[PDB]
Structure formats: structure tokens, C-alpha cells
């Protein structure tokens, strides 16, 4: 989710990678049965128009902004509970900080982007473009967090790193998660009748060209996940690691 915060309004963009899925307009129909203010949310508080009381000298502007972002977060939470995606917060530094003060579920926030431009008139795609660096930083953090999963498997004796070991474990359905270093390719002489993965010599003798792609296919086949770990978090000499089911 992309929450776009200003002192004047709030937008909500739901995105898949580099493209926007929707913009949460007044014709979105995920907003139909809402009990909070639907997006786009105008900041039509009493002080913004001059009605009500508490004239400017009371200096309640910060508290008005904090409560407005509290209402924006109420709408965000009411839409999140139905689809539970992570959210990126976009706005001014003080705006996203006021939002983090007030957010009811601040553990679902992955990144904040404060240098994005044209937050009111800007296109939904344009904002998604400006969040790409933060979305890739989060993808890198989600790979640094897999190092601890690999260490947990290693300490529980549920991690196989030999290529033959990983082949056997993935083939008989024991592979829970596969961790492959980026671009790691290996050719080998594989015969699943005896399950012997011996190293190839020239990849011109009847061997399988991508012995590691066969591992990836088997792990995906047996209801596992494949994580492709970048070269600087995964070791060059230990380029594969499989968290087994037992």
C-alpha cells in the first residue's frame, strides 16, 4: 500500500512492484462499505475552513494534524484488515513522523519516502515510481532477514549445502526453502533412479545443463519456496543452501 500524506489531503495507492493496481477512488468499490472517511481524504477540519472555534493563537495546529492523520490511519487500517498488505508512507518528513506517532499498526510499515514530489496533482504511477528505491531497499532487507533463517536451520541441523545433498532432499520432497545465490549455474550428471549428482566435466556428455534449475523445479514442485539471494549476502564458495523439512 502507498499512503500519500499531505497537510491538505491523503491518498491511498495499492501497488504490485513497479505498477499501480488501483488508486482507491470514489468508484473503487473496495470503499463501498466503509465506516471511516474514504480516499481521497480531504483535510476538512474546522481550523482549515475557519469555522468552529479555537482561533489560531491557541497553536493547536500540530494536534489537529496529528488527529487528522489518526483518522487517515483509521481508514487505512479499515481497508488493510480486508487485504493485509504492507504499506509505504509517503509525505513530508514531519507528516510521516506525525503519522508514525499515530499509526495503530506501525509494524506493517516497511518504508517511508520523504523526497517524493507532486503529492496532490501527481499521477498514481508517478508516486509508485518514486517509491521504487524504498521498495528495493525493503527487498534487500527481506534477504538479510533470511540469513537468520539459514542460521536457525544450520543450528537445528536442518540445512543441506552439498549439491548432491540438496538434490536428494529436494527430489524426495524434503525441501522446505531453497536459498540460491544469484546467477549460480552448475552442470552435473544426474540420474534420479539412483539419485547421484556427480560433477560434470564439459557439459557435453549427456548431463543436465542446469542442475541447480532442476533443484529449483523440484523444490517448487514439492510445495517449497525458492529464495534467490544476492551475491554479497550469500557466500561465493557456498552458493546453495536448502532448509529441509527434517
Amino acid at each position: 500500500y502507498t499512503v500519500v500524506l499531505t497537510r491538505d489531503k491523503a491518498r491511498l495507492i495499492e501497488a504490485a512492484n513497479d505498477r499501480v493496481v488501483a488508486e482507491f477512488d470514489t468508484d473503487n468499490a473496495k470503499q463501498n462499505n466503509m465506516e471511516g472517511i474514504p480516499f481521497p481524504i480531504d483535510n476538512n477540519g474546522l481550523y482549515t475552513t475557519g469555522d468552529g472555534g479555537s482561533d489560531r493563537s491557541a497553536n493547536n495546529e500540530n494536534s489537529y494534524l496529528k488527529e487528522f492523520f489518526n483518522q487517515v490511519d483509521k481508514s487505512v487500517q479499515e481497508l488493510w484488515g480486508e487485504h493485509k498488505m504492507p504499506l509505504v508512507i509517503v509525505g513530508d518528513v514531519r507528516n510521516i513522523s506525525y503519522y508514525k506517532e499515530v499509526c495503530d499498526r506501525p509494524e506493517n510499515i516497511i518504508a517511508t519516502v520523504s523526497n517524493l514530489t507532486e503529492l496532490e496533482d501527481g499521477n498514481a504511477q508517478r508516486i509508485i515510481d518514486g517509491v521504487q528505491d524504498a521498495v528495493e531497499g525493503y527487498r534487500t532487507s527481506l534477504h538479510e532477514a533470511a540469513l537468520g533463517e539459514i542460521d536457525k536451520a544450520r543450528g537445528a541441523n536442518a540445512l543441506s549445502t552439498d549439491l548432491q545433498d540438496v538434490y536428494r532432499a529436494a527430489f524426495q520432497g524434503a525441501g522446505e526453502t531453497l536459498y540460491v545465490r544469484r546467477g549460480y549455474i552448475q552442470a552435473a550428471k544426474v540420474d534420479e533412479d539412483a539419485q547421484t549428482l556427480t560433477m560434470a566435466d564439459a557439459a557435453a556428455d549427456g548431463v543436465t545443463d542446469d542442475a541447480v534449475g532442476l533443484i529449483i523445479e523440484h523444490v517448487i514442485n514439492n510445495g517449497g519456496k525458492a529464495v534467490f539471494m544476492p551475491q554479497e549476502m550469500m557466500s561465493a564458495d557456498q552458493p546453495i543452501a536448502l532448509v529441509t523439512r527434517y
Binding site: G36, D42, N44, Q71
Partner: protein, 84 residues
């Protein structure tokens, strides 16, 4: 005005009262010309001794005692002035 859902709905006018209904009830003495019922349409119909105005007003044509009865094949409500 957060949620901004309010807004003017101008229907704040009405008409003056018309003071309709039964003016003289059953068993009462009445004199000719006295209005018995002011009504819209014939909620009550003019029986013997009772006249009906252009307003559908029922009035006594002659003195006596006003009487209400449901008569006829239509089960209509009739008002009559019995000579009593």
C-alpha cells in the same frame, strides 16, 4: 465536517391548519344552519335533514337532534338531523 456527508435538504415548509372534523356530535340539539362536519370529500354523507356544501360541509337544514349512523349498501357514514 469530516466524512463530509451532510448537506442541505430543503423541505422546511408546511401549510396552515384547516380545523376540520366533527363540530356537533351525536345526540346534541342543533338549529338550522349549524355546521356539523367540516371535511375533505364525503367522509360523512348528508342524511335526512342535513345539507352539503360546495366544501363538502354538512350543515343542519332544520332544527332537531343530530344523529350518526352507518347506512346504505356502501356502508357509508351518514349524519342526520332527527326532528326531536
Amino acid at each position: 465536517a469530516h466524512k463530509k456527508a451532510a448537506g442541505s435538504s430543503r423541505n422546511g415548509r408546511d401549510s396552515n391548519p384547516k380545523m376540520l372534523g366533527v363540530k356537533i356530535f351525536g345526540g346534541q340539539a342543533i338549529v338550522a344552519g349549524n355546521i356539523i362536519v367540516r371535511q375533505r370529500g364525503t367522509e360523512f354523507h348528508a342524511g335526512a335533514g342535513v345539507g352539503m356544501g360546495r366544501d363538502h360541509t354538512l350543515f343542519a337544514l332544520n332544527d332537531g337532534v343530530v344523529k350518526f349512523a352507518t347506512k346504505g349498501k356502501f356502508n357509508r357514514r351518514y349524519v342526520m338531523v332527527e326532528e326531536a
